[PDB]
Amino acid sequence: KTINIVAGGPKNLIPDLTGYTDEHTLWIGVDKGTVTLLDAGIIPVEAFGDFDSITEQERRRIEKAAPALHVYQAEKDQTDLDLALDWALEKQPDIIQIFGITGGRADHFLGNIQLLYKGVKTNIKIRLIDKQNHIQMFPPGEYDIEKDENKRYISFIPFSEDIHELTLTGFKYPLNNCHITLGSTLCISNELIHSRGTFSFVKGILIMIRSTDL
Ligand SMILES: Cc1ncc(C[n+]2csc(CCO)c2C)c(N)n1
Ligand SMILES: [Mg+2]
Ligand SMILES: [Mg+2]
């Protein structure tokens, strides 16, 4: 099953959620995010955070449209989003997808990025999504990707430590059992030259950004 979380970032950086709706995909709203869900026509099963960020009318509008909507509050020491993720990881879905993850405040995004770290610990696919990016972290292993018709760039960035024996295949910029040192931006702006591409490394935490220039 799939769980989709919509955090409270600005709506303009968020994709069409509609096309992400499916019979095996539950939704949950976080902060303004639950408001975003209602506008799109999706009702959250649960909602996390408080209302000090949502408007008077906005609250009424939610209540009218979702009376039995339960809202779990945070403890100021854990982000609303951060809290929603525990609820979702617990459910153990094959995939968690988060939206409203980018915005004006950089801290916001930088945070969400750390959230992905909690996902490798639980070996559960956690993909972050916005209008032009798909972020995902991977532990050592061997992974396949398909060419993306709308986003042509695929970047790789080391996380906790150095990346060991990184191999890229089906990419414009190949790599064979390469050692990527922490902080390196060599593996940014790559592309797929085939229909399927493969990448793999033996040690470290790798980040993968698939993007577009619009
Ligand atoms: C493994 C690997 N991946 C991507 C690039 C290409 N690249 C690196 S930096 C950048 C943007 C600035 O030119 C681009 C396109 C490479 N050389 N090696
Ligand atoms: Mg929208
Ligand atoms: Mg708050």
UniProtKB/Swiss-Prot annotation:
Its EC number is 2.7.6.2. Pathway: Cofactor biosynthesis; thiamine diphosphate biosynthesis; thiamine diphosphate from thiamine: step 1/1. The keyword Metal-binding does not apply. InterPro entries: Thi_PPkinase, Thiamin_PyroPKinase_B1-bd, TPK, TPK_B1-bd_sf, TPK_catalytic, TPK_catalytic_sf. GO terms for molecular function: ATP binding; kinase activity; thiamine binding; thiamine diphosphokinase activity. It catalyses: thiamine + ATP = thiamine diphosphate + AMP + H(+). Keywords: ATP-binding, Kinase, Nucleotide-binding, Transferase. The keyword Electron transport does not apply. SMART domains: TPK_B1_binding. Catalyzes the ATP-dependent phosphorylation of thiamine to thiamine pyrophosphate. Is involved in thiamine salvage. This is Thiamine pyrophosphokinase.
